[PDB]
Amino acid sequence: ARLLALRSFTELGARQRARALLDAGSFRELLDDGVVVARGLLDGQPAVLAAIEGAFQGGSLGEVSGAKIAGALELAAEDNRNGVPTRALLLLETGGVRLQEANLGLAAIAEIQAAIVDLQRYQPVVAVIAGPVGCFGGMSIAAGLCSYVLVTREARLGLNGPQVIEQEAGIAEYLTGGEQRFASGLADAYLADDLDEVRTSVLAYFAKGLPARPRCRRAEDYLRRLGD
Amino acid sequence: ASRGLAWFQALAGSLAPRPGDPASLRVADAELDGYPVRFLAVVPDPDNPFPRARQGEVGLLEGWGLAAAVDEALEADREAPRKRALLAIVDVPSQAYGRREEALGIHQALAGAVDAYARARLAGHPLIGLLVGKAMSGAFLAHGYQANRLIALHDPGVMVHAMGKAAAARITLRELEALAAKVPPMAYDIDSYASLGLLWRTLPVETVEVPSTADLVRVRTCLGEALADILGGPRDLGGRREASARVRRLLREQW
Numbered sequence: 001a002r003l004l005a006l007r008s009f010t011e012l013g014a015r016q017r018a019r020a021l022l023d024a025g026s027f028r029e030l031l032d033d034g035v036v037v038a039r040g041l042l043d044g045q046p047a048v049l050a051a052i053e054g055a056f057q058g059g060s061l062g063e064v065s066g067a068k069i070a071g072a073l074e075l076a077a078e079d080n081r082n083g084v085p086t087r088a089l090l091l092l093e094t095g096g097v098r099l100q101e102a103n104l105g106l107a108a109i110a111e112i113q114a115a116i117v118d119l120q121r122y123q124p125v126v127a128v129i130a131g132p133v134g135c136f137g138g139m140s141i142a143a144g145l146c147s148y149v150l151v152t153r154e155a156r157l158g159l160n161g162p163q164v165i166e167q168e169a170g171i172a173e174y175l176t177g178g179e180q181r182f183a184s185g186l187a188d189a190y191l192a193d194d195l196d197e198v199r200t201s202v203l204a205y206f207a208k209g210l211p212a213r214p215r216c217r218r219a220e221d222y223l224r225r226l227g228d
Numbered sequence: 229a230s231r232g233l234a235w236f237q238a239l240a241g242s243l244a245p246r247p248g249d250p251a252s253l254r255v256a257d258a259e260l261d262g263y264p265v266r267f268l269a270v271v272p273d274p275d276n277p278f279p280r281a282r283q284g285e286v287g288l289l290e291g292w293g294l295a296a297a298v299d300e301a302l303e304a305d306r307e308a309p310r311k312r313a314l315l316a317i318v319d320v321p322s323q324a325y326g327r328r329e330e331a332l333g334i335h336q337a338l339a340g341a342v343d344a345y346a347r348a349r350l351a352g353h354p355l356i357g358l359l360v361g362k363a364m365s366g367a368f369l370a371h372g373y374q375a376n377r378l379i380a381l382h383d384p385g386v387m388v389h390a391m392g393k394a395a396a397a398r399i400t401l402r403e404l405e406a407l408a409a410k411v412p413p414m415a416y417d418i419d420s421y422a423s424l425g426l427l428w429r430t431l432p433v434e435t436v437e438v439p440s441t442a443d444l445v446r447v448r449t450c451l452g453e454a455l456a457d458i459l460g461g462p463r464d465l466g467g468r469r470e471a472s473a474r475v476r477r478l479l480r481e482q483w
Contacts, residue, residue, distance in 0.1 A: 064471050067475035099390075138390070144333075144335045145342060159338065169280060169326045175330045215340070217299075223289070
């Protein structure tokens with residue numbers, strides 16, 4: 001039990017990750033498609049967890065999977081307006097949308113993004129990107145909205161995947177790993193691939209509450225720095 | 229340079245960017261039906277400091293630039309009796325693709341734009357997205373898709389999708405227009421998109437590339453009615469698909 005194979009977070013499927021992070025005995029899966037939505041407690045506090053199964057369709061989002069995430073976030077915001085401090089935790093292993101439902105998937109991402117901003121008037125959303133799929137596409141923009149972004153060494157986070165970059169921008173020009181993101185200030189914590197460590201970081205960040213000056217509110221500063 | 233630029237000039241009255249803005253951004257304050265509005269458009273800038281963003285893409289400067297321009301309006305109207313409308317004129321080919329863009333966090337820049345637009349909407353600014361051309365992928369998420377109401381021109385050049393036709397062809401090893409045409413959420417045309425229930429209205433125009441006087445009148449009228457329809461009402465996304473509805477009903481039952 002002290003060995004990596006039994007302590008690893010990335011080795012777990014999405015449903016196992018969700019069960020492992022929520023307080024013992026609180027895990028309750030809704031709508032039991034490729035996304036797990038679960039209710040539970042996080043250190044005794046009401047919580048909802050959406051976890052994308054990257055092993056299925058590469059975690060590509062469609063109409064149903066997209067609505068599951070958006071709807072979970074929407075109900076958490078509703079809870080908070082009713083005085084219930086529900087916290088949302090997003091496990092983002094995804095590469096984009098399903099071509100066959102492309103515009104429904106994209107519309108759902110816009111709804112997910114809207115719900116994150118609404119909810120973060122009350123509670124921070126924590127996003128965990130652990131790999132092995134990592135987080136690409138429209139959902140990386142969602143990650144960029146979240147109060148806190150936690151990554152592992154095996155995580156990648158970015159807008160465009162490797163293949164679409166090379167096909168559009170070329171084999172080379174004249175980056176997305178968890179360590180790099182942390183070093184450039186685009187992720188808030190760099191985590192060992194260890195279940196207990198991931199769980200504790202998640203709880204510490206929720207207990208921290210809403211950040212005073214998150215990255216999204218620093219446009220003038222980013223514009224200055226890019227201007228350099 | 230683009231349909232977005234053409235329509236910005238027609239609707240706002242000016243062509244040149246503001247002193248403080250990236251040249252790939254057009255921003256102008258004006259009035260519609262006596263109501264304060266701000267027009268925003270992303271447009272091509274061949275002299276973009278970022279080489280991968282020189283053909284109208286939403287890249288680093290465009291994402292953070294939009295965030296800044298929207299937040300500027302939000303802060304200015306904090307005390308005003310009337311929050312100015314944000315009129316997004318949408319004609320964007322894609323997000324920028326590049327290694328410098330990824331290294332410098334283009335996903336975060338576009339998140340900045342989304343966050344500003346959403347906060348403005350939640351605070352009571354009417355947001356209207358006017359689709360006059362391409363509305364693609366992350367560029368559309370950043371510029372337009374947070375609108376209270378979406379209005380599209382009914383024209384073959386107006387396309388909403390998650391990826392380019394070329395990219396889609398590569399992944400399905402292909403011809404793709406033919407395949408995508410039978411699957412509405414997969415289709416690129418605006419009639420298919422409208423069938424999803426995601427547009428408030430569609431509008432035919434005579435000369436889509438440079439609006440006629442009658443076109444300008446029809447579009448201004450429609451924007452006016454969208455504005456009237458939003459004001460005082462709920463501040464949700466316009467889209468607010470039976471499967472989606474079922475999902476939300478089940479979540480509420482089981483919450």
